[PDB]
C-alpha cells in the first residue's frame, strides 16, 4: 500500500488547514503529492465559516 504521511504539530504545518503531506511508496521511496492527492488534501481541510446553503 502507498501511505500518505502528514506532519502534525506546529512545526509540521503547511499553513492554516493542516500539516504538510508526502506519499512514501511501498518500495521505500517517498515523493511529493500528485494533483489528485492535492485535491484530496484540499477537500479535507476544515472551513472557517458556517454552512452556506
Amino acid at each position: 500500500w502507498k501511505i500518505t504521511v502528514e506532519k502534525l504539530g506546529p512545526q509540521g504545518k503547511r499553513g492554516n488547514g493542516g500539516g504538510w503531506k508526502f506519499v512514501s511508496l511501498p518500495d521505500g521511496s517517498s515523493r511529493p503529492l500528485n494533483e489528485v492527492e492535492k485535491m484530496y488534501v484540499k477537500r479535507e481541510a476544515p472551513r472557517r465559516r458556517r454552512k452556506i446553503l
Binding site: 506532519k7 506546529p10 512545526q11 503547511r14 504538510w20 521505500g28 521511496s29 515523493r31 511529493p32
Partner: protein, 116 residues
Amino acid sequence: THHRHHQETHSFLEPESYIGSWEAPKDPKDAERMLAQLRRDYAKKVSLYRKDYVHEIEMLRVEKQRKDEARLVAERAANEERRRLKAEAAKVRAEERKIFQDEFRKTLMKERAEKL
C-alpha cells in the same frame, strides 16, 4: 509552519535496496546466523538514528536558549528606561506638591487661630 520550508527541506529518498535483498542459503543454520546478523545491523542503525536525534534536539535547545536570553536583556533594557522616566516624573510632581501643601497648611493655621 509554512509550505515552502517543508517542500524544500524534506529528504525525499530513493527506493530502498534493502527490501527483497535476502538470498536463500543452502543451510538453515547459516540462514539463522544471517537473520541474527540482520537483527544486529538493525540495532546498530537504530543507535545511530538515536544519536542523530539527540544532536538535533540539543541544537534546537541551544538556539531557543539564546533567543530567550536576547529577548530577556532587551526587555530589561526597556524596563530600565521606563523606570527612570517614571522616577523623574514622580520627582517633579513631588517637588510641585510641597508649595501647595505649605500654602494649604498656612491657610488652616490661620483658620485655627481665628477660631481660637
